[PDB]
Design a protein around this ligand. Sequence first.
Ligand SMILES: *CCC(=O)Nc1ccccc1Nc1nc(Nc2ccc(N3CCN(C)CC3)cc2)ncc1Cl
Ligand SMILES: [Cl-]
Length: 347
Amino acid sequence: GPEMVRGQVFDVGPRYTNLSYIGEGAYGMVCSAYDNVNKVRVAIKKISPFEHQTYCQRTLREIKILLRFRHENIIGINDIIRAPTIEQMKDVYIVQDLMETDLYKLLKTQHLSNDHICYFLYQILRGLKYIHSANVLHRDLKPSNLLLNTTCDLKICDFGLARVADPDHDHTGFLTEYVATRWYRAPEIMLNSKGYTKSIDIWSVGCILAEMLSNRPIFPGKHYLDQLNHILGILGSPSQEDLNCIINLKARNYLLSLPHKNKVPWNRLFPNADSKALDLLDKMLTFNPHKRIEVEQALAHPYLEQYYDPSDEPIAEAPFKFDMELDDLPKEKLKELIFEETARFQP
Ligand SMILES: *CCC(=O)Nc1ccccc1Nc1nc(Nc2ccc(N3CCN(C)CC3)cc2)ncc1Cl
Ligand SMILES: [Cl-]
């Protein structure tokens, strides 16, 4: 019999055995397993994407990116199990390093010391430096996408929404749809942006920093436009200069339709926080994406001075590229690319 976990097939033997359910991830069931080759427990997530084009797109994005990335602060893919033949292939099993928890869970239970916050933020930005050096955007950074171990080591995961950066094609309408998690969206997303620039990830990191400082999401919008109102509830109404940068006619009109809001000083929002952390937070949560701090500058910020060290901050060999643009491909074609991409792990 293939191994079973809570009524579900988990066909990862004989190599991986001694399974334990650990949770539901974004794609399906995840277990811990004993790897009989490397003599260690690992994480295995069961993906069943093939009925839907979007699940197929995200699965392929994640696999292609994570096979190509290698970095301490980024989750790997160690092994992939799928069927010998494509018709047989209904599930893909992605094997990853087993971690202890994620930041989302840690923040439910623990107030973090300034030291831990500083180190966590370093690691996020260290990993993001590498991602960005490959001209890749994560586009869904949030606490639950940051895995942690007992040692405070941090790995960014869940690259299903990643894209190659494309600042030339960033511009789009007002009210455009967006996939990434609401609370971590930059203001421009709700205004003129498709999220194809690096500044999109920096915003999300700033939201995570705020959350590490207080154990509350800084901008817990309930709906699309509400999110932006929460943002402006802290940043205040945008400056003249920043209004003038938005090209969408609709967007700046929408902004002018809103009631004026007073900027809430960071001092006041986080009274016990390190002033250096707040200065960096300010620079990450800047309304105008052009003026927003970049990953290398954030790393070089005084707050992270005990860690910043380019000699210990690897970068990618060269820019990433999709071989095919994945969004005009039907699911049967995406299933074939997934088959191909996973063949290097077949006996
Ligand atoms: C990267 C995002 C992701 O894959 N997150 C996720 C979500 C649910 C379950 C697993 C999982 N991925 C990984 N988890 C671990 N380790 C791990 C997760 C959850 C726990 N919990 C212990 C307490 N409760 C029983 C709930 C589960 C423990 C350890 N490691 C690697 C990955 Cl990829
Ligand atoms: Cl809305």
